[PDB]
Amino acid sequence: PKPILYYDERSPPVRSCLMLIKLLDIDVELRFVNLFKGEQFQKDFLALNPQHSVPTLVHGDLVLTDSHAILIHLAEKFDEGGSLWPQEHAERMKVLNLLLFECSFLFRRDSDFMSAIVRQGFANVDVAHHERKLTEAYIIMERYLENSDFMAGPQLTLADLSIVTTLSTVNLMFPLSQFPRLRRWFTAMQQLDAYEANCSGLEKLRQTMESVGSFQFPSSSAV
Amino acid sequence: PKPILYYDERSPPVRSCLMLIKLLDIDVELRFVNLFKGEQFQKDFLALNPQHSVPTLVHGDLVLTDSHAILIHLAEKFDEGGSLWPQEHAERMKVLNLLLFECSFLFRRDSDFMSAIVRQGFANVDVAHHERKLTEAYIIMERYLENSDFMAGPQLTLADLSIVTTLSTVNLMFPLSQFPRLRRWFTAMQQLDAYEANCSGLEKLRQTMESVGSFQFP
Numbered sequence: 001p002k003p004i005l006y007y008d009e010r011s012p013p014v015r016s017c018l019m020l021i022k023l024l025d026i027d028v029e030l031r032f033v034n035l036f037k038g039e040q041f042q043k044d045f046l047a048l049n050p051q052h053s054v055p056t057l058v059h060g061d062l063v064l065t066d067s068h069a070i071l072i073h074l075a076e077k078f079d080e081g082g083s084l085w086p087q088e089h090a091e092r093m094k095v096l097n098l099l100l101f102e103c104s105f106l107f108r109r110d111s112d113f114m115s116a117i118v119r120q121g122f123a124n125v126d127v128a129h130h131e132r133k134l135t136e137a138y139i140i141m142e143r144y145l146e147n148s149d150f151m152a153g154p155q156l157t158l159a160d161l162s163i164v165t166t167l168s169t170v171n172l173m174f175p176l177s178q179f180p181r182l183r184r185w186f187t188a189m190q191q192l193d194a195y196e197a198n199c200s201g202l203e204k205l206r207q208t209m210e211s212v213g214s215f216q217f218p219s220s221s222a223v
Numbered sequence: 224p225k226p227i228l229y230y231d232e233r234s235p236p237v238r239s240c241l242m243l244i245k246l247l248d249i250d251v252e253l254r255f256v257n258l259f260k261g262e263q264f265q266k267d268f269l270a271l272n273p274q275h276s277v278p279t280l281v282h283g284d285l286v287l288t289d290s291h292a293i294l295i296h297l298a299e300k301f302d303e304g305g306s307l308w309p310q311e312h313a314e315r316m317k318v319l320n321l322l323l324f325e326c327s328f329l330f331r332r333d334s335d336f337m338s339a340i341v342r343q344g345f346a347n348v349d350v351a352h353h354e355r356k357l358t359e360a361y362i363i364m365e366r367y368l369e370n371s372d373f374m375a376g377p378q379l380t381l382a383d384l385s386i387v388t389t390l391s392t393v394n395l396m397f398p399l400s401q402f403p404r405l406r407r408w409f410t411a412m413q414q415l416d417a418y419e420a421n422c423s424g425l426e427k428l429r430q431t432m433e434s435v436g437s438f439q440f441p
């Protein structure tokens with residue numbers, strides 16, 4: 001059975017999976033769940049994923065409800081012995097470590113900021129607070145890129161796919177001027193053919209956020 | 224060489240690693256990082272882990288900065304052929320999925336609640352809001368337990384070790400009376416010899432929290 005991805009491309013974790021699907025030319029059925037319309041709370045989708053989150057992958061009997069598991073699963077099944085999810089144990093653990101950084105730190109903080117915008121309105125959000133928290137993530141990624149060419153090593157891995165989508169979303173608001181490593185890496189990610197899978201959903205998220213939060217992102221920020 | 228675990232046993236993710244270490248009899252060198260005194264911001268430790276978080280594992284040249292990676296790494300190196308980290312791909316993905324639920328949902332929401340107690344003060348916390356967020360996590364785990372005795376299937380896996388420590392920390396504040404599968408599971412987890420590794424740090428956190436928060440857990 002061919003994988004089924006429940007998705008809203010405005011979601012950075014969704015876009016990470018879309019990038020991997022494009023990069024590996026995986027044939028996957030797409031099923032749209034409109035998060036703006038609360039379609040993730042439809043009875044059928046909650047029964048499938050009680051966390052009411054996208055991406056959700058159904059591949060045969062396997063139901064994955066987190067992008068980082070989806071990325072790893074798809075790499076193991078369609079990039080057998082590949083380098084995106086490296087064979088050597090220490091290299092693989094480094095990728096896993098940064099995938100969890102995306103869960104625990106980067107996405108958590110960007111999610112906190114974006115949800116404040118919609119619940120409070122942009123003009124009411126404590127931007128300085130979220131700028132500090134998210135600049136802290138910039139600093140950490142800059143430190144990783146100071147010791148490594150890509151996020152998890154010399155070479156493109158799942159960690160870059162996971163991180164770049166959320167990065168590009170943070171960078172809608174907060175400029176990367178003071179982070180030369182992260183600018184260089186981001187530019188390199190944007191040269192990848194697979195980055196087209198991030199472009200469209202990022203722009204749709206921008207259009208949605210500027211309507212719901214009623215504001216305009218600083219256009220100069222985005223790389 | 225021997226793995227080194229930087230730790231503060233008040234941390235639920237730390238206790239998950241401590242439980243695995245006891246379950247697998249892993250010889251590790253423990254190094255205490257006092258989070259209450261901000262030692263995670265010490266220059267040498269930030270250099271090691273820019274996320275300034277525990278648990279952090281140093282095993283040779285490998286530096287792991289997240290409990291879920293540490294659990295997987297330790298299982299792979301010290302429990303090859305075990306049931307905690309299943310070799311079969313579908314079973315392994317199901318464990319991984321629940322480890323990420325712990326990062327993405329359970330711990331995130333408990334962290335939000337716990338940080339609000341020490342920031343605003345317990346008397347100033349929107350208890351109802353966090354009770355709603357954390358009860359939702361209870362509901363989800365109750366559903367995960369519908370078909371199985373453990374979170375990821377019929378046998379104990381890394382998902383149970385990761386989740387039980389945060390759950391016991393949530394359970395300081397919200398009982399499991401309404402969730403029969405979850406209460407059954409939590410009680411079964413407490414019968415494990417390895418659960419002793421969770422006892423000390425949970426109580427140390429309770430004492431620290433009841434002191435800074437100026438309240439009592441029921």
Ligand SMILES: COc1cccc(/C(C)=N/C(C)(C)N[C@H](SC[C@H](NC(=O)CC[C@H](N)C(=O)O)C(=O)NCC(=O)O)c2cc(Br)ccc2O)c1
Nearest residue numbers: 010011013035052053054055066067068111114115118327
């Ligand atoms: C208050 O609600 C809200 C409004 C606007 C934006 C957000 C928000 C958190 N936005 C961000 C930018 C982070 N994008 C989210 S991504 C979609 C959510 N997916 C996950 O949380 C999966 C995480 C998991 N660890 C993984 O890696 O897969 C999601 O599905 N939310 C649905 C839900 O929780 O009910 C986002 C975008 C949109 Br257009 C709408 C909602 C979002 O949360 C939050």
Ligand SMILES: COc1cccc(/C(C)=N/C(C)(C)N[C@H](SC[C@H](NC(=O)CC[C@H](N)C(=O)O)C(=O)NCC(=O)O)c2cc(Br)ccc2O)c1
Nearest residue numbers: 104233234236258275276277278289290291334337338341
């Ligand atoms: C800030 O003061 C304070 C006092 C008491 C309790 C908290 C608090 C928010 N506590 C909770 C219960 C959430 N426990 C944290 S756990 C330790 C932290 N580790 C991680 O966040 C790792 C998550 C990662 N995904 C993983 O799985 O490994 C931590 O290291 N924080 C340090 C930091 O961010 O600088 C906690 C406990 C204590 Br005793 C103190 C601080 C905490 O955040 C907060």
